[PDB]
Amino acid sequence: ANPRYNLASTGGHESDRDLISYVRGVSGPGDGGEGQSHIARPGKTVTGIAATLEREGKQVR
Amino acid sequence: MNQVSGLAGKESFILTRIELFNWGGFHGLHQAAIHQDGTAVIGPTGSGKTTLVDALMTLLCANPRYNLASTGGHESDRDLISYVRGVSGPGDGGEGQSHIARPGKTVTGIAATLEREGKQVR
Amino acid sequence: DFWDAFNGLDREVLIQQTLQLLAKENRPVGLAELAELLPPAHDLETFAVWIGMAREAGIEVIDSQREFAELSDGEGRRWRFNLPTTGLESQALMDIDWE
Amino acid sequence: KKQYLARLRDFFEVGENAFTLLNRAAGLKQLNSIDEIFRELVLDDHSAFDRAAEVANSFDG
Amino acid sequence: NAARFVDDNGESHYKALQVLVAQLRDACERNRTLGAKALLDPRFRLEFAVSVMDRQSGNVIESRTGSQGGSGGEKEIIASYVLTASLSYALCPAGSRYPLFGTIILDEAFSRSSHAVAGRII
Amino acid sequence: ESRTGSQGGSGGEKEIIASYVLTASLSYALCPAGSRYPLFGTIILDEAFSRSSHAVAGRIIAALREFGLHAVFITPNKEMRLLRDHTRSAIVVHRRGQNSNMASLSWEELERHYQRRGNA
Numbered sequence: 137a138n139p140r141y142n143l144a145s146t147g148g149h150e151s152d153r154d155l156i157s158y159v160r161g162v163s164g165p166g167d168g169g170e171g172q173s174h175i176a177r178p179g180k181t182v183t184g185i186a187a188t189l190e191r192e193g194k195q196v197r
Numbered sequence: 198m199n200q201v202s203g204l205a206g207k208e209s210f211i212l213t214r215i216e217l218f219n220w221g222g223f224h225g226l227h228q229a230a231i232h233q234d235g236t237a238v239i240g241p242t243g244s245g246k247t248t249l250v251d252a253l254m255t256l257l258c259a260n261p262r263y264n265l266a267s268t269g270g271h272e273s274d275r276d277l278i279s280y281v282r283g284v285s286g287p288g289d290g291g292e293g294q295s296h297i298a299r300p301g302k303t304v305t306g307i308a309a310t311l312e313r314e315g316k317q318v319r
Numbered sequence: 320d321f322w323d324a325f326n327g328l329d330r331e332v333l334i335q336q337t338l339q340l341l342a343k344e345n346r347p348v349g350l351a352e353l354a355e356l357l358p359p360a361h362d363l364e365t366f367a368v369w370i371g372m373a374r375e376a377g378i379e380v381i382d383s384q385r386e387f388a389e390l391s392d393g394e395g396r397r398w399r400f401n402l403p404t405t406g407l408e409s410q411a412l413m414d415i416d417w418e
Numbered sequence: 419k420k421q422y423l424a425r426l427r428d429f430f431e432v433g434e435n436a437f438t439l440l441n442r443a444a445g446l447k448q449l450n451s452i453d454e455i456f457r458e459l460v461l462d463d464h465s466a467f468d469r470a471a472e473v474a475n476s477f478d479g
Numbered sequence: 480n481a482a483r484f485v486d487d488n489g490e491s492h493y494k495a496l497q498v499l500v501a502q503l504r505d506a507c508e509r510n511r512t513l514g515a516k517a518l519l520d521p522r523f524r525l526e527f528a529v530s531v532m533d534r535q536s537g538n539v540i541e542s543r544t545g546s547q548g549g550s551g552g553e554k555e556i557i558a559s560y561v562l563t564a565s566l567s568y569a570l571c572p573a574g575s576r577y578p579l580f581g582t583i584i585l586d587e588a589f590s591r592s593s594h595a596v597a598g599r600i601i
Numbered sequence: 602e603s604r605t606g607s608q609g610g611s612g613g614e615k616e617i618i619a620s621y622v623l624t625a626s627l628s629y630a631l632c633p634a635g636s637r638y639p640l641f642g643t644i645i646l647d648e649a650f651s652r653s654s655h656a657v658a659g660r661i662i663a664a665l666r667e668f669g670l671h672a673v674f675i676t677p678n679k680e681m682r683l684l685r686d687h688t689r690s691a692i693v694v695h696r697r698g699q700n701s702n703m704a705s706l707s708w709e710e711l712e713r714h715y716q717r718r719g720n721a
């Protein structure tokens with residue numbers, strides 16, 4: 137419901153990343169030519185995520 | 198590449214040998230030779246690599262913080278007594294003292310030799 | 320470095336290979352002799368494992384007596400390892416279970 | 419998302435704590451003695467540091 | 480509790496409640512001192528300890544009653560085992576011993592343990 | 602870049618810079634008053650590199666070499682390739698039952714050559 141993003145490296149303190157930064161594809165860490173965080177998808181955009189689970193041929197997505 | 202490594206000793210002191218006697222799990226006399234080019238202490242979990250560093254840290258610092266790498270900088274996991282007595286784990290829940298390897302009269306000796314241009318400080 | 324870390328000393332296979340070598344020899348074998356018979360592709364990575372043998376099976380290792388072994392790595396550079404003297408024997412090693 | 423998570427709960431017959439613990443399991447790197455692993459990994463917060471503030475304000479009234 | 484039985488128009492009762500609420504505010508302001516956490520945090524009023532026993536002999540064989548005393552690999556082993564047990568219990572539907580959501584995700588779980596003990600964790 | 606431009610992958614350059622600064626601070630602390638080299642040149646770091654990639658660990662070792670620090674690295678039989686490249690001995694520590702013991706080992710590159718009967 138309220139996932140803790142990047143918990144492996146940011147554990148102990150508040151997480152840097154959020155859902156908005158994943159949808160927009162911000163590149164906070166990797167810089168070198170960073171155009172203000174280099175938002176990959178600044179305009180109207182759609183992001184989809186899907187996970188499939190199986191058990192004895194029964195599927196749940 | 199090998200030329201630069203000759204700086205060791207030529208400039209300052211470098212540790213070269215560690216001596217342990219009844220230190221932690223190191224029963225009896227144990228000697229470790231440290232190369233002038235740098236050394237690697239390796240082994241499986243539950244050995245004496247952390248105990249070996251803790252001996253030198255005790256020798257070097259006024260208030261050593263034992264088992265720092267495992268506690269993550271928190272309150273020191275151990276103390277001098279638990280190393281001297283050779284405490285091996287909490288020690289069950291019914292006394293027994295099986296965990297303690299040196300409960301009675303015992304002596305533990307820790308030595309460290311540092312070399313510089315032949316001059317040796319122990 | 321990804322590829323380099325991909326391939327490494329799989330001590331599982333080396334465990335059985337060393338056990339089979341001792342079974343074939345069925346004699347007290349030192350570290351230098353083991354290196355000669357078994358060409359280590361990772362240098363000290365193997366040796367520690369073999370030392371893990373001696374100390375795991377109770378085969379006491381002597382540090383005063385030092386053997387040697389000359390081994391060349393992939394790129395051709397040759398190194399002389401100053402191994403200690405051990406008494407690896409197949410019976411005890413096969414007695415002890417491995418993870 | 420509340421209704422969707424309720425549907426997930428129903429399908430997998432596990433409360434929200436199960437998936438919250440699954441989330442926290444991805445940040446196990448920063449671990450310490452058993453006490454910290456218990457008080458930071460399992461048995462989620464359920465602390466009462468906020469209810470105390472309301473109780474104090476009511477007692478102020 | 481003693482003051483609730485006094486007949487003074489709720490004066491002693493008010494004073495006792497005032498003391499209690501003062502304690503509560505003291506804890507709340509310093510929201511991470513060990514005392515405050517123990518006071519207002521359910522999972523801080525009780526300690527924790529693990530104990531490895533024998534399958535046939537129920538006697539405790541090694542009881543880490545907090546007693547941190549452990550190597551980087553030992554603590555990692557215990558934490559991974561306990562976390563796996565907790566995940567299995569949580570994901571198991573009530574009255575069942577097989578979790579219905581059988582997939583779990585670990586992120587760089589093992590870093591302080593040897594390659595021989597990580598396999599035991601897996 | 603007045604402020605560090607970026608890293609070499611998930612804190613690569615960041616970790617490199619932090620380790621370099623820490624090594625410089627240690628060298629200064631061990632360096633006596635108005636001295637270029639630290640009198641106490643030995644540094645011990647338990648769990649050498651567990652959270653550090655092989656690319657960065659080599660850089661930390663190189664930096665330790667630059668600042669004139671003789672280091673002994675403690676690893677759980679991990680990261681043997683770089684330790685072997687950047688060291689010349691190893692104290693194999695093994696604990697059987699309740700008692701532990703050590704076994705010293707050393708190696709050194711024979712002058713010989715990189716390769717003979719081949720490209721030079």
Ligand SMILES: Nc1ncnc2c1ncn2[C@@H]1O[C@H](COP(=O)(O)OP(=O)(O)O)[C@@H](O)[C@H]1O
Nearest residue numbers: 242243244245246247248275279286548550551
């Ligand atoms: N005071 C102590 N209490 C409990 N165990 C101790 C103590 N001192 C040493 N030990 C034991 O000695 C070893 C010290 O850690 P070690 O395994 O050498 O660390 P690592 O291999 O992670 O570098 C462990 O097996 C530990 O149980």
